[PDB]
Amino acid sequence: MSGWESYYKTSGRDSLIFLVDASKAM
Amino acid sequence: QVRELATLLHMKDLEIQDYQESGATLIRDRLKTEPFEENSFLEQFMIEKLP
Amino acid sequence: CPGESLINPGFKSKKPAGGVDFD
Amino acid sequence: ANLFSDVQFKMSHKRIMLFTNEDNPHGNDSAKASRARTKAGDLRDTGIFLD
Amino acid sequence: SQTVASHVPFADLCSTLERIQKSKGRAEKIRHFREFLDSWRKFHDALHKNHKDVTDSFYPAMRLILPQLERERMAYGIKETMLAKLYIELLNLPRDGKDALKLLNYRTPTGTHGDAGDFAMIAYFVLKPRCLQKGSLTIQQVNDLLDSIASNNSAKRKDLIKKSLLQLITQSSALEQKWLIRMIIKDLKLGVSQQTIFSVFHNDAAELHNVTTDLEKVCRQLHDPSVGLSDISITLFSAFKPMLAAIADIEHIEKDMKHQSFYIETKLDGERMQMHKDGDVYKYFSRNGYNYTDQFGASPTEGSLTPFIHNAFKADIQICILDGEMMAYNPNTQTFMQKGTKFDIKRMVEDSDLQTCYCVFDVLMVNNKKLGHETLRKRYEILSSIFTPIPGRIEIVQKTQAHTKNEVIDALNEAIDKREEGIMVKQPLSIYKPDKRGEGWLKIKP
Amino acid sequence: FESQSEDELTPFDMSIQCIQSVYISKIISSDRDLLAVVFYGTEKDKNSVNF
Structure with missing residues (x-):
């Protein structure tokens, strides 16, 4: 009887989102 | 000043250790910092940035 | 709270009897 | 704590005294110290005095 | 009368269940289950080389992997609320403390930590600092404890139920206790269908379970994958x-x-x-x-x-x-x-x-x-x-x-x-x- | 169980003497109170939980 230790051993598509700043500096 | 900063770092390390022992989990795993050791830090500084 | 008996809580630790002590 | 719970009467006070001469019972294992601290905190919350 | 269930630590089954749960597709879960089954069957063959008549089967683990199909055991009589109350009593946690309130009103997301709908997760979190890191319980011992608890609930006795639950708590880790709570509630959420488990167990197991409705007979008869059943039909004194x-x-x-x-x-x-x-x-x-x-x-x-x-x-x-x-x-x-x-x-x-x-x-x-x-x-x-x-x-x-x-x-x-x-x-x-x-x-x- | 000096009482002896004195005082003063004696660090075990 060997121990239980021996017997177990433990595509797609591109998406883009632009983000334009609307500050007065722009 | 260096000695005082080392003491503060050690206290912060104790805080980290206790927070870990409390079962708390940090949201970001990148913020983890390694334990501070004085000899290792001094050796690294002297070998790298002293010149 | 201060000077509390360690055997019977809720009661002050009675001091030992000293009898007569002349000045 | 289990011994305290076994009592069926009404207890005005609950106290434990620790007779020991080892100030560092758990120095090798940090987890055991944390478990002991947690258990002591739980006992204090339950209303058990420690001496 | 040696049984393989007495040689299999419960921690191994808990780890297998955790791996199955933390898997993306069906392939990995089936692979883990098949590996566990093959290890169990190899150990069974090694152990029972000499004995001729053997009643040992995979039932001890099957009744835990699929608690909903258990029929031999009677109702445990405990659900989330009663389990939380018993955990509060046995652990000696404060009644008005944070842990007790979290366990009781587990559905409230006021905690903001862990999960607000899974009681097992909160039990595991609470027991993490109060439990050891390694267990010492086998499948047979856990089955015996569950049988004792169920019979004792049927017998209108609660001190013995408390004793059994206390023993289970004292001889289990956080993960093992979490899995035990899940089995007591009779839900595992493994993500793998019962039909898939039966199919991986044997080629013709769903039909036998439909005809018989008892995990003991299915586990016992369908042991060697090669050997099948010629004809399966309704039989006396067996629910269909x-x-x-x-x-x-x-x-x-x-x-x-x-x-x-x-x-x-x-x-x-x-x-x-x-x-x-x-x-x-x-x-x-x-x-x-x-x-x-x-x-x-x-x-x-x-x-x-x-x-x-x-x-x-x-x-x-x-x-x-x-x-x-x-x-x-x-x-x-x-x-x-x-x-x-x-x-x-x-x-x-x-x-x-x-x-x-x-x-x-x-x-x-x-x-x-x-x-x-x-x-x-x-x-x-x-x-x-x-x-x-x-x-x-x-x-x-x-x-x-x-x-x-x-x-x-x-x-x-x-x-x-x-x-x-x-x-x-x-x-x-x-x-x-x-x-x-x-x-x-x-x-x-x- | 070690004595620092030849003419001295070991910690165990002092603990036992204190326990006996407290028992006698409780008997004389309040006989309806509850007392218990437990040991930790022994080889044998006797408790409900079977620790």
Whole structure:
């Protein structure tokens, strides 16, 4: 009887989102 | 000043250790910092940035 | 709270009897 | 704590005294110290005095 | 009498379950389950080289991997709330403390940590600092503890239940205790279907489970994958999954019956029951395989329905299986009390004047004749020659021959008039397929 | 169980003497109170939980 230790051993598509700043500096 | 900063770092390390022992989990795993050791830090500084 | 008996809580630790002590 | 719970009467006070001469019972294992601290905190919350 | 379950640590099963849960696709879960099964079978072969007759099987682990199919064990009597209360008492946690409140109102997301809907996660988090890192319990020990707890709940004793739960808590880790809580609640959320588990166990296991409804026989008979079963059919004293009916559209009903005459029958509201009779030995089984024989009586001498119908069977019939519906009868009016208000046919009070009536609609075995594979008409005819009905205690459901839609609408209108749920339709040539739905039986409601 | 000096009482002896004195005082003063004696660090075990 060997121990239980021996017997177990433990595509797609591109998406883009632009983000334009609307500050007065722009 | 260096000695005082080392003491503060050690206290912060104790805080980290206790927070870990409390079962708390940090949201970001990148913020983890390694334990501070004085000899290792001094050796690294002297070998790298002293010149 | 201060000077509390360690055997019977809720009661002050009675001091030992000293009898007569002349000045 | 289990011994305290076994009592069926009404207890005005609950106290434990620790007779020991080892100030560092758990120095090798940090987890055991944390478990002991947690258990002591739980006992204090339950209303058990420690001496 | 060595058993492999006594050599398998519970931590291994817990780790396997955790790995299965933390898997993306079915392939990895099946691979882990197959690896565990192969290891168990290899260990079984190694251990039982010399012994000839062995009752050892995979049941000890199967009853835990699929708690919902457990029938040998009685109701534990504890759910999330009772388990939280017992954990609070045994752990000596403060009643008004944060942990106790979190455990009790586990559904409240006020904690903002972990999960607000999974009690097992919160139990694991609470027990993480209060539990060891390694356990020392085997599968057999856990099964024995669960059996003790269930029997002791059945015996109206709570101190022993507390002792068993305390032992389990003291001899388990956080993960093991979490898994144990999940099994006690009878939910695992492994993400793998029971059908998949049965299929990986053996090529023909779902059919055997449908016919028998007992994890012991399935685990015992289907051990060597190579060896199969020649023929599997309904057997005496073994619950079989009943055959249900599916919704039907009145418009195309004739098409669903291949343009042939069919049977119209009244829908019966109540329990679904099946009766096994061998001599004076009676067994009653419910819809899902639970044994209700105690209520209705397993012998003519004592019972609630059998003591009156013992002598209602023709002399020839000695072995008999029947399927039917159990409902409540009011004699002072001579009418059936519709299911709902004022009574439950499952736990009727003795003092009530209402009694129990069994309406039969199928026969599956008579004098060691297997009628499962015969047509509905033949089973109906054989049923007509089983018992002489004695109104109020056992009856046969009337079925009317109909081959037009106007008849179906007339029947449904009349059923609504008599304040019934609806009407059902049966195909005369339909075969009995246990556990299947919408094969030859259809139902119609307003 | 070690004595620093030849003419001295070991910690165990002092603990036992204190326990006996407290027992006698409780008997004389309040006989309806509850007392218990437990040991930790022994080889044998005797408790409800079977620790």
